[PDB]
Amino acid sequence: FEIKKICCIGAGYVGGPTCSVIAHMCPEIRVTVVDVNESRINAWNSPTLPIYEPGLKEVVESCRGKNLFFSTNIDDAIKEADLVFISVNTPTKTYGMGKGRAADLKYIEACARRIVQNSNGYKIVTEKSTVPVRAAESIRRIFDANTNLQVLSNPEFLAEGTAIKDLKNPDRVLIGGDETPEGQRAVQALCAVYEHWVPREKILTTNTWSSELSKLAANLFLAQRISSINSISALCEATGADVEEVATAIGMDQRIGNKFLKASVGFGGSCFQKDVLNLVYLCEALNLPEVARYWQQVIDMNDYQRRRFASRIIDSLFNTVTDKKIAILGFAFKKDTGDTRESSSIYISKYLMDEGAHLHIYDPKVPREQIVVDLSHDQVSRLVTISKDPYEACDGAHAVVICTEWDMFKELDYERIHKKMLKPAFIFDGRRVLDGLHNELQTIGFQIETIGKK
Amino acid sequence: AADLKEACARRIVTESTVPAESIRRIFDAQVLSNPEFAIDLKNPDRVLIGGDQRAVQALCAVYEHWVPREKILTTNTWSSELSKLAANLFLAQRISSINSISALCEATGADVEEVATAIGMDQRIGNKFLKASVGFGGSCFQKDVLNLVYLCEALNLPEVARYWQQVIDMNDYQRRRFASRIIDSLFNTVTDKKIAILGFAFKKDTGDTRESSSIYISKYLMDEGAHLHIYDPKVPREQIVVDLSHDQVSRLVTISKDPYEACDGAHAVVICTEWDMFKELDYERIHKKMLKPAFIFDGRRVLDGLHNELQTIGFQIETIGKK
Amino acid sequence: MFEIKKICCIGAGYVGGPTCSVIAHMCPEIRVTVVDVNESRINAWNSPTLPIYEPGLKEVVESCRGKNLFFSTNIDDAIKEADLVFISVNTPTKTYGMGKGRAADLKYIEACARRIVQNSNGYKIVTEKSTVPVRAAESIRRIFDANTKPNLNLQVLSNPEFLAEGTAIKDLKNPDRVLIGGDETPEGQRAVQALCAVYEHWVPREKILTTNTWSSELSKLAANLFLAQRISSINSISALCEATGADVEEVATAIGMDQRIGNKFLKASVGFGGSCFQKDVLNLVYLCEALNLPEVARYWQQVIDMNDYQRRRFASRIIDSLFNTVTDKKIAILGFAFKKDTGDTRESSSIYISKYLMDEGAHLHIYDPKVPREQIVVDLSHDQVSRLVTISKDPYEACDGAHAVVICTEWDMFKELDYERIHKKMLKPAFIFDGRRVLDGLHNELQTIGFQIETIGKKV
Ligand SMILES: NC(=O)C1=CN([C@@H]2O[C@H](COP(=O)(O)OP(=O)(O)OC[C@H]3O[C@@H](n4cnc5c(N)ncnc54)[C@H](O)[C@@H]3O)[C@@H](O)[C@H]2O)C=CC1
Ligand SMILES: NC(=O)C1=CN([C@@H]2O[C@H](COP(=O)(O)OP(=O)(O)OC[C@H]3O[C@@H](n4cnc5c(N)ncnc54)[C@H](O)[C@@H]3O)[C@@H](O)[C@H]2O)C=CC1
Ligand SMILES: O=c1ccn([C@@H]2O[C@H](COP(=O)(O)OP(=O)(O)O[C@H]3O[C@H](CO)[C@@H](O)[C@H](O)[C@H]3O)[C@@H](O)[C@H]2O)c(=O)[nH]1
Ligand SMILES: O=c1ccn([C@@H]2O[C@H](COP(=O)(O)OP(=O)(O)O[C@H]3O[C@H](CO)[C@@H](O)[C@H](O)[C@H]3O)[C@@H](O)[C@H]2O)c(=O)[nH]1
Ligand SMILES: O=c1ccn([C@@H]2O[C@H](COP(=O)(O)OP(=O)(O)O[C@H]3O[C@H](CO)[C@@H](O)[C@H](O)[C@H]3O)[C@@H](O)[C@H]2O)c(=O)[nH]1
């Protein structure tokens, strides 16, 4: 049967865009996006959405109330839907066994049990959340216990900031399901939904475990690249080579690809580190410590890169930063989003705060309450100010610290900035956005240090 | 670490894969970089040339006969020497990463071929050098990782040193757990059992055996006392003897002239090189003449699909990245 | 040519105050102005009760306070009037962030340099007496080269100090040597020579060494290294003595008679204290980890670890002889200063021994002849103090009913106590743990009296 009603438990960075794009593409399907956070739902029904995603505002306003809905009423959405997406979060457990390593599956378990408490007849439950391998066996055991529901895997590959383009023109779609009769009917049903706008060559079908594991493996390879090119940047700094030339060189070899080779202060975002940690913690239970400590190097290098960079700043400021004003330009974890999950800016700020530095922080899309929240747990009242515009942040600053590649940081007037900074002045370029702009800054008198230059 | 023993350099008074500023001091008391990346010579992805200036352009002038200036990259010399290494790093690291994934698959019922397929369709990742195996071989890869590791130990960059050292370690793990897998399947002992080793080259379509995983699987099985019968189409007999020597070799190694005679009375067939001729073998013939139960360890994913036939023929088959 | 006639010293502490009082005493024709932010301190200098205890200091200060020696909170005006500016502030170990517990906190220095280049014009010599990491001057030079003014020409020197507390006045008046470092340029050597001219009034010329800034800074550290290494080395031997039957004092004598080794700083102890020895080693250990010298770092780290071991060994001997329980047991701590003839407590082994016994729930009664009472209370805090710490007005009150007497500071008076009397009112068995060897030779008398006496480097 053709899927006519779709429910998505979890209206976050996945459930919101992914269902907006399903509705814009499939006008004969009813897509209700639900969530327990009533303020989140209400924001999804607002002129100011709860997440900044380019193109997302257009897409939502094009369907909300035609076939795109956002509701707090979790039950009826499931009861009447033909397909329930699970797109809830799977953080790293902060407690109990595996604290700091294992993924917390309590929010998935919550969906699985509310689905069966609120549904009759035939429905397709799809796991889009990034789970461990064989987690779809767990939903199956639940459904075969409190007894007709099928369980599928359809991970997402959207990266935040480019989520709309990536959802309209995906490299591939991954659908994993049972190798049974009942399962292969449910898979080709989900294919039908995607086939409205994804070509069939770019829809990949496998079994449940191979799918759950492909998502982790892909994120490992991606994260590994960054760390790999990040490690080269420290190599460059010690041999006077240049990480951008080396990266450009590496990337011309077609078998390597030219993507994901931009050195940086450190990868951030909701998923990479938690997924790597997840896979490592998987490996211990499976008695696979080599695989475990192999991928663990992807995290160690990231942590190194951030620390090395944080120390770069303190060392250069004549080894002390207590009571010194420093500007942090960029708090989002990447450009063109307002998500600050695991942003390297948190980790540099927290390092600089431990030295007693007074921070002035600016970011175009990140709301101030998030920064205050991210930097706390007061120490924040004393040391952290949040600036309305950048020139305010650098007024009387000893140093300018760029942690996010917002294109506008080139556009700044460093003549003006230099006139009002304490002397001597420094710029610490954590994203290489200022390449080529050096000689200017050098003549202006700024001392410019960046990732991958001696 | 790099055996730089220079002998090329001083004789002169462009490059090899090196860690050139030593040249400019010998010469101080025309030095560019131009490393290599088979018959690849004809349509190179890119031609690397590094210096400090018309000399880069003389060497651009020579390549330009068949490579367009778009595909020719000039840089400083340090960045040229580094770029050669880091490429091989990223390449070798892809292989070790996918090898690590295979172990994961074997323990969870995923297929490394399905997982690699899904991985590589991410254009950012790219789908080259993602075919799991028993271990990467060849002159440059392991040499180049170690070389860079030493270079890091001597620049006080141990975080970096030990990060890339995992590319070697995981390759070592992939080779030993395969060997360990052969031995465990044959009831924990392999002493005096004939085992057929199929394929001694490091990749297919070469005679090159340098650092071939076949060397290390064979040596592992030699430490147990297995009777190895080795056959490889192009690798010369005497190179096998030399590669396993340093007597242990004479007591345990037969170099067979064809695969069917090396598989006769064997407990296991261990495929280490991806020669296509191994796919086309009469495996129903092999199995009648092998001891029972017969085994096939496919360290190259060359028997994919044929499993049902082989399994029904009565063969017991184990392959990388699929239980 | 150029003569220093006005000296400002930012920092009125154990260095700034004595070094300037001596300078002023020997040079009637130079105006020495010692400034500090701490108004309660400055005011104590202008009082008859000086803020620190140094034998002879009260004499030297009173000799020229109001004539050519002054103490003022007016940090701004002294800078602007001075021909020479001493930076003499503290460089503690960072208690936070990167290098916590290792690296030196340069914030106070950096504060001086910016306040100097703000409040100053014309020609001044900026001199770094505080103990800094190698190259720390170079940071001051850069601060001056970016915040420059018309006709401002601030010169930067290294003039490290070697006085020991408890001998500061004697050391400042006949120092083994003076160390001055400056850039090997025209401008620097001018300023180097102008600082020599000052010291030349009372110090022999040959004893005035001139080097570059680095060499100067590093020398101060290395000397402090070599010094502490001797203590930790003899303390190491003392351990081997209690295990073998040797006697550290006998061994120390035999060692120091070799003139290549020399016979000073071989007096084994519960462990070295004072503000500089531990931090200066750690500072250098930290400095090596940035210089990619891991072998040198761990070489010097041993000085600190041996001293931490000498202390904890002693604390454990006490606790073991009280059968590993000390709860509510009275114990007398004689000596809280880090050496005799001083009020200073910074890093005094007495603190650490008191902390080890407070973790056992003992009732400590502490007596010191010079350390002020609230200092001890501060030093033992961060109430555990309320329940466990009494501060004694005299040693006999401190030993009244005690299980043990722990001598930590070699105050000459402890050796003269009425130990017959102490013993009568102690609980038996009645221990004396001598952490300073001040009671050697009284072992026979103390033993017939009934005391259980133990000491560093003597076998039990
Ligand atoms: N952010 C990204 O780029 C991508 C993330 N993923 C994965 O997709 C998942 C979704 O992550 P995000 O959307 O970024 O996180 P999120 O925190 O923004 O979304 C989770 C939402 O689900 C709601 N929720 C949780 N449990 C619920 C329950 N029992 N009932 C109803 N609502 C519930 C929460 O209130 C929250 O608003 C994660 O597992 C992530 O690893 C996969 C691909 C891309
Ligand atoms: N005490 C000793 O035996 C010797 C120490 N040194 C070195 O000399 C330095 C001075 O140490 P001490 O005098 O013993 O320490 P201290 O703590 O007694 O003296 C420092 C004084 O400077 C004041 N101060 C700090 N920053 C200031 C500022 N910006 N403006 C004005 N006043 C400020 C403080 O309030 C304090 O009164 C240390 O770095 C030490 O390593 C060198 C030789 C001997
Ligand atoms: O060359 C690069 C590329 C990325 N980054 C950093 O990597 C982090 C994450 O970037 P990105 O990959 O876009 O993060 P996400 O937006 O979370 O997307 C990733 O994680 C998602 C959730 O697992 C997957 O859906 C996507 O495929 C995957 O790209 C950011 O902080 C970037 O600054 C670099 O430093 N250098
Ligand atoms: O998907 C793959 C691809 C290769 N391999 C194995 O890994 C090795 C790769 O060898 P190969 O790449 O052919 O080695 P070389 O022929 O020495 O050349 C490589 O190393 C050179 C030196 O670093 C570079 O110039 C080349 O671009 C690079 O392909 C072989 O043993 C293969 O069997 C796999 O296991 N999976
Ligand atoms: O043989 C000895 C000598 C000293 N100490 C102890 O070691 C510590 C240090 O003693 P001392 O050297 O007098 O301390 P300071 O008074 O701080 O002076 C030292 O530290 C100063 C600051 O760096 C330097 O200027 C001096 O040269 C150097 O002697 C004290 O707690 C002593 O009890 C011993 O245990 N055994």
**Secondary structure of chain A as H, E, C letters:** CCCCEEEEECCCCCHHHHHHHHHHHCCCCEEEEECCCHHHHHHHCCCCCCCCCCCHHHHHHCCECCCEEEECCHHHHHHHCCEEEECCCCCECCCCCCCCCCECCHHHHHHHHHHHHCCCCCEEEEECCCCCCCHHHHHHHHHHHCCCEEEEECCCCCCCCCHHHHHHCCCCEEEEECCCHHHHHHHHHHHHHHHCCCCHHHEEEEEHHHHHHHHHHHHHHHHHHHHHHHHHHHHHHHHCCCHHHHHHHHCCCCCCCCCCCCCCCCCCCCCHHHHHHHHHHHHHHCCCHHHHHHHHHHHHHHHHHHHHHHHHHHHHCCCCCCCCEEEEECCCCCCCCCCCCCCHHHHHHHHHHHCCCEEEEECCCCCHHHHHHHCCCCHHHHHEEECCCHHHHHCCCCEEEECCCCHHHCCCCHHHHHHCCCCCCEEEECCCCCCCCHHHHHHHCCEEEECCCC
Indicate which residue's Cα is closest to atom 19 of ligand 5. Answer: C164
Q: B82: which chain A residues are within 8 Å (Cβ-Cβ)?
A: 232, 235-236, 239, 241, 246
Asked if the Cβ–Cβ distance from C133 to A319 is below 8 Å, we say yes
CA C286 to CA C59: how far, in whole Å? 40
DSSP C196: H
Find the farthest-apart pair of alpha carbons in chain A and give their distance in angstroms, rounded: 75
Q: Which atom of ligand 3 is nearest to the CA of A343?
A: 31
Residue A357: closest C-alpha in chain C:
C97
Q: For a pocket test of ligand 2, which of C10, C35, C36, C171 has the largest count of ligand atoms closer than 8 A to its C-beta?
A: C36
Catalytic residue numbers of A read: 156, 215, 271
Best of A18, A334, A335, A451 for a ligand 3 pocket test (most atoms within 8 Å of beta carbon) = A334
Contacts 24+ apart (CB under 8 A), A436-443: A437/A410, A440/A414, A441/A414
Q: Do A351 and C290 touch (CB under 8 A)?
A: no
CB contact under 8 A, A354 and C139: no
Residue of C96, C98, C106 lying closest to A311 (CB–CB)? C98
Q: What are the residue boundaries of the structural domains of chain C, listed by start?
A: 6-220, 277-455
Q: Which ligand is nearest to the CA of C73?
A: 2
**Which residue of A160, A220, A233 sits with most ligand 3 atoms within 8 Å of its CB, as the best mutation to test the pocket?**
A160
Residue C178 and residue C209 in contact, taking contact as beta carbons nearer than 8 Å: yes
Tokens representing C224 are 């402090």
Assess contact for A403 and A429: CB atoms under 8 A. no
Q: Is A330 in the pocket of ligand 3 (CB under 6 A)?
A: no
Closest CA to B37 of B99, B97, B109, B90: B90
Q: Which of B87, B101, B123 sits opposite A253 (nearest CB)?
A: B87
Residue whose tokens read 């948190």: A346
Contacts of B58 (CB under 8 A, 6+ apart): none
CB contact under 8 A, C97 and A314: yes
Give yes or no for a contact between B244 and B253, defined as CB atoms under 8 angstroms apart. Answer: yes
Atom of ligand 5 nearest to the CA of C167: 16
Nearest CA of chain A to the CA of B171: how many Å? Answer: 10
Q: Report whether B109 belongs to an annotated binding site.
A: no
- The amino acid present at B303, given as its one-letter code, is L
Q: How far is CA C377 from the centre of its chain?
A: 20
- The candidate with the shortest Cα–Cα distance to C198, out of C51, C32, C335, C36, is C32
Task: Tell me if residue C63 falls in helix, strand or coil.
Answer: helix
Q: Is A358 near ligand 1, meaning CB less than 6 Å away? A: no
Question: What's the CATH number for C277-455?
Answer: 3.40.50.720
Is B173's CB within 8 Å of A290's CB?
yes
Determine the Cα–Cα distance for residues C77 and C69; give it in Å rounded to an integer. Answer: 15
Which ligand neighbours the alpha carbon of A159 most closely? Answer: 3
Question: Which residues, other chains included, contact C114 with Cβ-Cβ below 8 Å and sequence gap of 6+?
Answer: C143, C147
Ligand nearest to C-alpha C110: 2
Nearest to C101 by CA among C358, C347, C344: C347
- Looking at domain B109-323, which CATH architecture does it have? 3-Layer(aba) Sandwich (3.40)
Q: Distance from the CA of B265 to the center of ligand 2, in angstroms? A: 86
Candidate list C94, C124, C129, C220, residue with the active-site label: C220
Residues 6+ apart with CB under 8 A from C335: C350, C367, C368, C407, C408, C409, C410, C411, C414, C436
Phi-psi region of A334 (alpha: psi -120 to 50; beta: other; left: phi over 0): beta
- Say yes or no: CB of residue C137 within 6 Å of ligand 2: no
Do the Cβ atoms of B71 and B45 come closer than 8 Å?
yes
Q: Do C96 and A323 touch (CB under 8 A)?
A: no
List the single residue in B with minimal CA-CA distance to A231.
B160
Name the residue among A221, A288, A294 with its Cβ closest to that of B125.
Answer: A221
Q: What is the DSSP letter of C8?
A: E
Looking at CATH, the fold of the domain delimited by A5-215 is given as: Rossmann fold (3.40.50)
What CA–CA distance (Å, rounded) separates C372 from C193?
Answer: 42
Do residues C370 and C345 touch, judged by C-beta distance below 8 A? no
Inter-residue contact B255 to B231 (CB < 8 Å): yes
DSSP state of B225: T
Q: HSE (CB half, 13 Å, CA atoms) of A66? A: 13
Ligand 5 atom 7: the closest Cα is on which residue? C272
Q: Which two tokens stand for residue C294?
A: 């891991």
d(CA A67, CA A28) in angstroms, rounded, equals 8
Chain breaks of chain C after residues with C–N above 2.5 Å: 382
Do you know the residue count of chain B?
Answer: 323
Burial pattern B259-282, b for ≥16 Cβ within 10 A else e, equals beebbbebbbbbbbbbbeebeebe
In this structure, the residue with its CA closest to atom 29 of ligand 3 is A159
Q: For the domain bounded by C6-220, which CATH number is listed?
A: 3.40.50.720
Is B88 a pocket residue for ligand 4 (Cβ < 6 Å)?
Answer: yes
Of B45, B100, B115, Cβ closest to residue A253: B45
Q: Report CA dihedral (C28, C29, C31, C32) to the nearest 10 degrees.
A: -50
Length of chain A in residues, anyone? 454
Residue C160 exposed, middle or buried by CB count within 10 Å (0-12, 13-18, 19+): buried
A227/B110 CB distance under 8 A: no
Distance between CA atoms of residues C173 and C178, nearest Å: 11
Interface of A with C (CB under 8 A): 310-311, 314-315, 318-320, 322-323, 351, 354-356, 423-425, 445
Which H/E stretch holds residue C85?
strand C84-87
Q: How far is CA C313 from CA A278, B216, C305, C308, C336, in A?
A: 45, 53, 12, 9, 18
* Amino acid letter for position C200: E
Ligand 3 atom nearest residue A161's Cα = 16
Edge-first strand listing for the sheet containing C6-10: C69-72, C31-35, C6-10, C84-87, C123-128, C153-158, C178-181, C208-211
What are the phi and psi torsion angles at C166 (to 5°)?
Answer: 80, -15
Q: Look-up: residue for tokens 């129903």?
A: B284
What technique determined this structure? X-ray
Q: Whose CA is nearest to atom 33 of ligand 4?
A: B203
A68 assigned to a ligand binding site: no
| Inter-chain CB proximity A213 and B111 less than 8 Å | no
Residue C179 assigned as binding residue: no
Name the closest residue on chain A to residue B148, using Cα atoms: A235
Q: How far is residue A40's CA from residue B243's CA, in Å, rounded to a whole number?
A: 66
Inter-chain touch C146–A424, beta carbons under 8 Å: yes
Distance C370 CA to ligand 5 centre (A): 18
**What is the Cα–Cα distance from B219 to B245, expressed in whole angstroms?**
10
Report CA(C274)–ligand 5 centroid distance (Å). Answer: 7
Contact indicator for A103, A274 with CB cutoff of 8 Å: yes
Tell me which of C90, C110, C158 to substitute to probe ligand 2's pocket, judged by most ligand atoms within 8 Å of the beta carbon.
Answer: C90
The fold of the B77-108 domain, in CATH, is: 1.20.5
8 Å CB contact between A352 and A321: yes
B131 lines ligand 4 (CB under 6 A): yes
Distance of CA C390 to the CA centre of its chain: 26
Phi/psi for C263 (5° steps) reads: -110, 25
* C223 labelled binding-site residue: yes
A219 lines ligand 3 (CB under 6 A): yes
The conformational region for residue C449 under phi > 0 = left, psi -120 to 50 = alpha, else beta, is alpha
Instruction: Using the mean position of ligand 4's atoms as its centre, give its distance from the Cα of residue B95 in Å.
Output: 9
Catalytic residue positions of B, numbered: 36, 84, 140
| Residue from C183, C173, C231, C237 nearest C211 by CA | C183
Report the nearest atom of ligand 1 relative to the CA of A90: 39
Which ligand 2 atom is at minimum distance from the Cα of C163? 44
CB contact under 8 A, A320 and C105: yes
Report yes or no: C427 and C413 within 8 Å, Cβ to Cβ.
Answer: no
Element (H, E) at C72: strand C69-72
Of all atoms in ligand 4, which is nearest to the CA of residue B130? 1
**Distances in whole angstroms, Cα of residue A57 to Cα of each of A46, A54, B276, C327:** 10, 7, 54, 70
Q: Is A255 annotated as contributing to ligand binding?
A: yes
Rounded CA-CA distance C221/C162 in Å is 10
Query: Which amino acid appears at position C458 of this protein?
Result: K
- Please answer yes or no on whether C96 and A423 come within 8 Å at the CB atom: no
Dihedrals phi, psi of C384, to nearest 5 degrees: -60, -35
